[PDB]
Design a protein around this nucleic acid. Structure first.
Ligand code: ZN
Ligand code: ZN
Lengths: 276, 747, 286
RNA sequence: CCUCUGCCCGCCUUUCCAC
RNA sequence: GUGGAAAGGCGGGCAGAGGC
């Protein structure tokens, strides 16, 4: 479907405070062979999609011209009226929770949200344009697990009656703070008009996650994840056709998500703008 | 009265009189007493045919059946024309029933004038049985030591047998249960080590007799040794494939009453096929050697008319099993033409097991070729508008899906609205009437017939009436056919009239709330049935294994006979009305669900009773499962079937309960876990000291990764628990069973 | 013969092991992307006339696994006549529930010679909990997803026999698009992704009339010994009909398979791959 | 170093298939 | 012309109460 190229973003997710992404004495999820923790791709994609739908919901007025089909929603959840595709923004009842998923391919081509994360509706659906891989540990932290150090902790938290001061403690496992991860996000350039927007929106939602939390408790301190990029390479359609290493590389080993979202958006991606 | 109903009933009353000699109440030899016992029964409340049937126990011993003279005088003296019987055909029927007795058990089984002896067990010939009834209630006839049966205990046997035979109708389907209930635990011939029951020797004599009659062999064809050595018999054998993927592949939308109705509907598919082989071949249910969890064997005749009818039955059953279930379940039927001399040992080689492994290979080569009689199996004809059932997964053409009785916003296939309604009637259901497919009340359909539910307050309809779990034709019309069949059926009820839910069971487990799932089967069973060298000895060894899993498992869930079980790992004392649902109980294996608490004790209350039900010479193997209530079945059962297979290919005698080298193994052995539980559990069953227990499991899980020894030593010391676990400071590997269970028994 | 063993070194879970109709469905969606509709039809015509790809099978560190032929299922008793009757029951059932075989043992099973089975399966199937959260109140609607999680150095590979101008022209480009786009469902959580390597595999075989297959054929005539597969996948958001495929290891006799085409109401048409992958095999008397 | 506490409560699949 | 498409395991919860 008009495939042009794939933009790959590789960076290190870093846990400044102890990450906890559970399973159901409260385990963080683990590889069933190595036993080392990991961050899923369902759990990182959907935390970016979540924080960004709350972002668009506040801006259903300013964005009606840059994004068409955003004038059909009024900001809110369609939870009060148990009908899907009413006039609100959060309009698909998945099971009990209401999520913005656009109803139709020709509207989801014009939403800022459903164009990047995709949508499902009768009479076809829009496949996502990103692939959020699972974020395993880096090899420096395998080789601290090989070295015999800890890699998860067991934290004990208590709830307290405020009048009697009676304590009833519970324990959460969480990954040790400091653990470096390794992510990869593979955008799919299906249109060449909106590829800058979908990358600026993917970096907007990554900047929300650096002041929100990823996974677990977070309001009590479990998030505080930090994104550290390495390199963004755009793979052209001809590169696959031949397998010759002939692809643009935007190199930024030490940059934030706010130092790359607008500081270098046109200064680093200028060579990606050229080749389309 | 015809001749086919005479040869069937002559062999079924041929070694009658063997019990009344042990009671001792006429002149002491059974070739006169059973003659007297029958014509006495012909006199008072007597049909006039019971006098004629005492020409069979009279001419038994071949000195009385000698030189063709003494019979023809006496058989002239009766009125055989008053039944239609010719002077010759009645004589021709005495020789068949005489030939059938020798093949069945053979002439080598024939003993001399011995005294009274106990029937030695077929699983262990050193031990022996007492005498009892076939109640399935409040008696586990374990093989005890040898004790001679007292001669007045037979007079209680005969006197009940007098009254039951007087009431019961003179027909094969009405005398098979009467002789089954009384003559099961009576030995056929008295000798040293005899393991053949008398009922099995009569059930199988009337089978080989009628398969000689339908074969067309004549008396001079027996008199000359000619019905033997010729391939005149036909071991029909049938089998199912994909029983597991049929019963358990349901989604999370199917409740337990549905699963319990999938198991009870694979039965009726199995009894529809067998009862079409018996009816279109003229045979009786004495021919069905076993019918046990899909795998049934039938003895028939070898005529070019019988083989012509079997190939329509195998055609119409497989085409039925393909329109209904898109290749999830297949029926492989084969048959081996056996001779007469292959019904028993000859020379030193077992010819019967050799002729039954020639039939196991026809079946083996057929379950490979899975639907090779459809002729459109690989024709990709493109049917349109295929919706798809949620509960089972079936493509269904052009919509036509009934709204579900549970939630009418979901559309199921039609054959799951039957198995909800059937699965709702399982409290009340006293059997099934089996009749024509287009008739009033038919819920389910088999390949051949349509099955009405015979409920409790309601008249039975049908030509043949299958009755679950009793040998008593109670309220059946006097013209119908009685098929008794046994089913292991313990369900915990709800306070409604119904079967308890995956929730409602597991909400009565003490501790954490889990759904316990056990699945296990008898270790090395097929090599047990290959030393059985006669068809009376295989029919013995196949009922007793079937009766354990049908009827001596519901006795265990009652908790009866903890003398023979003893002291088992019990989290709580075994309650009065347990919360255990028996989904499927096969002849050599079972799948039971229930609370995690009581499905644990039951898995040691089963191994311990099976070990005594045999003489010890056959062992079990169990998988056990702990699951959330709202787990789907296909995930649950595929786990535990693997987790049963895990506890099998190690050493095949191993309970599963709850290091990458290859010198360890996950599954506890039986006595191993029951000796770990005798020690480690009665000391720790430490008030809310669970940190002593939960860290000790994490101390254990460094050992898998001798740093653990002093770490346990400070921990057992910084409280003061020195008596607890002295050898724990490999025994750290084999304490994971006892800790992880008793932790779940306290929240 | 000498095949081309395309390794797929995974970068996550997969959804299931790819069968040979979902490998050709993926290549047909890659070659429609990087070339177009007028090159998908020249792709099918090189499989119709020529080349064959197989299903995918696991590897684990230079041991390559291949499906057990159903040819050894009857003869197993006559295979194992150097054993006693205590382990001729327990070798006989593990050699029948076995699903895969080494490259060394598979070459023995075609000869009807004794073999051993793999001690350890190179992957696990696990169910991972996934929760949908309402944006406004974080309400949780948990569901369970089952995916294949591989070991350290294991992965999956398929085979290819055919001309080399098809391989570099249509397969080695498509298996680099598929490395970054993934194979199977949930490819937006990083599922069916992989790196890719290419090797030279040689499999010895006997010469006979009958031949195992290493792909889900849609046979014109009935084969010798089979095992049904009843699958039908998905295609641009339309549900395919189900089709009786035959599982790998089924013995056919001189059967070329066949591609079935379907219509499904798309602007183009849909070719379901059903071609066989023959390896010669020595059978017993039936 | 002694004394009570040592996980609760939930959702547990929803929706799409052009005659 | 992929058993597919969309779908954050989370929402809340002082390891504390007395003990020189
Ligand atoms: Zn949208
Ligand atoms: Zn159904």
């Amino acid at each position: 479907r008009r495939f042009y190229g794939k933009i790959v973003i590789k960076g290190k997710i870093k846990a400044v405070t102890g990450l906890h992404i559970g399973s159901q004495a409260n385990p963080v999820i683990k590889d069933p062979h190595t036993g080392l923790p990991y961050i899923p791709g369902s759990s990182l994609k959907g935390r970016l999609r979540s924080l960004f739908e709350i972002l668009v919901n506040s801006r259903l007025g300013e964005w009606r011209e840059k994004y068409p089909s955003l004038a059909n929603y009024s900001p809110g959840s369609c939870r009060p009226d148990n009908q899907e595709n009413c006039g609100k923004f959060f309009n698909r009842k998945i099971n009990r929770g209401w999520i913005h998923v656009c109803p139709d391919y020709e509207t989801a081509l014009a939403c800022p949200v459903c164009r990047l994360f995709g949508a499902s509706g009768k009479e076809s659906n829009f496949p996502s344009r990103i692939i959020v891989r699972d974020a395993f540990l880096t090899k420096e932290w395998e080789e601290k697990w090989r070295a015999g150090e800890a890699i998860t902790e067991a934290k004990i938290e208590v709830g307290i009656d405020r009048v009697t001061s009676q304590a009833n403690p519970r324990t959460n496992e969480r990954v040790v703070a400091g653990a470096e991860f390794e992510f990869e996000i593979i955008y799919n350039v299906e249109n060449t008009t909106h590829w800058r927007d979908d990358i600026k929106n993917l970096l907007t939602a990554m900047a929300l996650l650096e002041d929100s939390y990823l996974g677990g408790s977070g309001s009590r301190g479990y998030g505080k994840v930090k994104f550290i990029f390495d390199s963004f390479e755009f793979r052209p359609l001809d590169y696959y056709r031949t397998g010759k290493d002939e692809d643009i590389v935007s190199i930024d080993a030490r940059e934030k998500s706010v130092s790359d979202i607008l500081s270098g958006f046109d200064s680093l991606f200028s060579e990606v703008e050229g080749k389309l | 009265m015809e001749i086919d109903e005479l040869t069937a009933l002559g062999g079924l009353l041929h070694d009658i009189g063997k019990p009344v000699q042990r009671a001792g109440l006429y002149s002491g030899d059974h070739s006169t007493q059973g003659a007297r016992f029958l014509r006495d029964l012909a006199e008072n409340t007597g049909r006039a045919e019971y006098e004629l049937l005492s020409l069979f126990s009279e001419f038994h011993h071949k000195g009385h059946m000698k030189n063709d003279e003494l019979m023809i005088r006496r058989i002239k003296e009766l009125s055989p024309e008053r039944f239609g019987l010719t002077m010759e055909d009645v004589l021709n029927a005495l020789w068949i029933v005489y030939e059938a007795d020798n093949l069945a058990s053979g002439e080598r089984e024939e003993g001399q004038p011995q005294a009274s002896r106990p029937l030695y067990s077929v699983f262990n010939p050193g031990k022996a049985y007492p005498w009892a009834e076939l109640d399935f209630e409040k008696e586990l006839p374990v093989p005890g030591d040898v004790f001679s049966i007292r001669s007045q205990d037979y007079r209680e046997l005969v006197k009940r047998l007098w009254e039951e035979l007087s009431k019961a109708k003179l027909r094969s389907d009405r005398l098979l249960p009467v002789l089954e209930k009384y003559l099961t635990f009576v030995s056929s011939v008295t000798s040293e080590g005899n393991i053949i029951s008398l009922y099995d020797h009569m059930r199988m004599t009337s089978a080989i007799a009628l398969a000689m009659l339908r074969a067309g062999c004549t008396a001079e064809d027996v008199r000359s040794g000619r019905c033997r050595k010729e391939k005149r018999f036909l071991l029909i054998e049938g089998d199912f494939s994909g029983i597991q993927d049929f019963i358990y592949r349901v989604s999370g939308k199917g409740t337990l009453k549905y699963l319990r109705a999938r198991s009870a509907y694979l039965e009726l598919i199995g009894w529809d096929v067998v009862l079409e082989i018996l009816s279109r071949l003229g045979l009786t249910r004495a021919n069905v050697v076993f019918n046990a969890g899909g795998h049934f064997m039938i003895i028939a005749q070898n005529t070019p008319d019988a083989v012509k009818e079997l190939e329509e039955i195998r055609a119409k059953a497989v085409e039925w099993l393909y329109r209904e279930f898109e290749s999830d379940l297949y029926l492989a039927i084969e048959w081996e033409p056996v001779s007469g001399r292959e019904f028993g040992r000859e020379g030193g080689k077992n010819l019967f097991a050799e002729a039954r492994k020639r039939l196991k290979h026809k079946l083996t080569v057929r379950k490979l070729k899975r639907f090779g009689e459809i002729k459109g199996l690989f024709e990709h004809g493109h049917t349109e508008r295929l919706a798809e059932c949620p509960v089972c997964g079936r493509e269904l053409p052009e919509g036509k899906l009934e709204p579900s009785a549970s939630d009418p916003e979901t559309k199921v296939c039609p054959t799951c609205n039957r198995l909800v309604s059937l699965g709702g009637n399982l409290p009340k259901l006293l059997g099934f009437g089996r009749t024509a497919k287009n008739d009033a009340g038919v819920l389910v359909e088999g390949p051949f017939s349509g099955f009405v539910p015979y409920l409790q307050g309601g008249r039975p309809v049908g030509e043949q009436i299958l009755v679950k779990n009793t040998l008593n034709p109670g309220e059946i019309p006097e013209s119908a056919q009685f098929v008794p069949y046994f089913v292991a059926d313990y369900f915990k009820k709800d306070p409604k009239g119904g079967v308890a839910t995956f929730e409602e069971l597991s909400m009565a487990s003490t501790g954490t709330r889990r759904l316990g799932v056990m699945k296990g089967d008898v270790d090395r069973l097929g090599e047990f049935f290959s030393s059985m060298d006669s068809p009376s000895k295989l029919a013995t060894a196949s009922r007793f294994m079937d009766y354990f899993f049908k009827g001596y498992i519901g006795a265990i869930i009652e908790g009866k006979f903890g003398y023979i079980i003893g002291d088992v790992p019990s989290l709580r004392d075994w309650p009065e009305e347990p919360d255990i649902v028996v989904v499927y109980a096969g002849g050599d294996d079972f799948f039971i669900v229930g609370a995690w608490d009581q499905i644990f004790e039951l898995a040691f209350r089963v191994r311990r009773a099976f070990n005594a039900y045999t003489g010890g010479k056959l062992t079990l193997s169990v998988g056990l499962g702990y699951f959330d209530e709202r787990t789907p079945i296909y995930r649950m059962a595929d786990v535990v079937s693997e987790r049963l297979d895990t506890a099998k290919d190690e050493g095949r005698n191993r309970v599963f309960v709850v290091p990458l080298d290859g010198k360890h193994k996950l599954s506890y052995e039986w006595n191993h876990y029951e000796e770990l539980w005798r020690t480690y559990a009665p000391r720790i069953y430490l008030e809310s000291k669970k940190g002593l227990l939960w860290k000790l499991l994490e101390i254990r899980e460094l050992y898998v990764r001798v740093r653990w020894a002093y770490l346990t030593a400070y921990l057992l010391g910084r409280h003061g628990l020195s008596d607890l676990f002295p050898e724990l400071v490999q025994p750290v590997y084999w304490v994971d069973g006892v800790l992880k269970i008793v932790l779940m028994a306290v929240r | 013969p000498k095949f081309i063993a395309v390794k797929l070194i995974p970068k996550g879970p997969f959804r299931d092991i790819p069968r040979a109709d979902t490998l050709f469905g993926a290549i047909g969606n890659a070659i429609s992307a990087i070339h177009g509709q007028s090159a998908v039809e020249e792709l099918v015509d090189a499989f119709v006339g020529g080349a064959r790809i197989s299903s995918a099978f696991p590897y684990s560190g230079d041991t390559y696994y291949l499906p057990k032929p159903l040819s050894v299922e009857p003869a197993l008793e006559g295979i194992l006549t150097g054993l006693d009757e205590e382990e001729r029951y327990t070798t006989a059932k593990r050699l029948r529930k076995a699903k895969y075989l080494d490259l060394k043992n598979f070459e023995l099973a075609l000869r009807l010679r004794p073999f051993t089975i793999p001690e350890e399966i190179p992957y696990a199937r696990v169910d991972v909990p996934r929760v949908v959260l309402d944006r406004v109140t974080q309400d949780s609607s948990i569901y369970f997803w089952e995916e294949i999680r591989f070991r350290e150095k294991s992965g999956v590979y398929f085979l290819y026999s055919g001309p080399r101008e098809v391989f570099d022209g249509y397969i080695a480009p498509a298996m680099r698009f598929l490395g970054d786009t993934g194979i199977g469902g949930k490819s937006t959580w990083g599922a069916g992704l992989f790196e890719v390597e290419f090797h030279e595999m040689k499999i010895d075989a006997p010469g006979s009339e009958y031949s195992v297959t290493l792909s889900n054929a849609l046979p014109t005539k009935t084969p010798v010994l089979w095992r049904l597969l009843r699958k039908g996948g998905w295609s641009f958001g339309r549900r395919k009909p189900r089709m009786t495929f035959i599982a790998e290891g089924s013995i056919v006799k001189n059967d070329p398979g066949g591609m079935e085409r379907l219509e499904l109401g798309l602007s183009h048409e849909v070719y379901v791959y059903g071609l066989t992958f023959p390896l010669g095999v020595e059978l017993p008397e039936g």
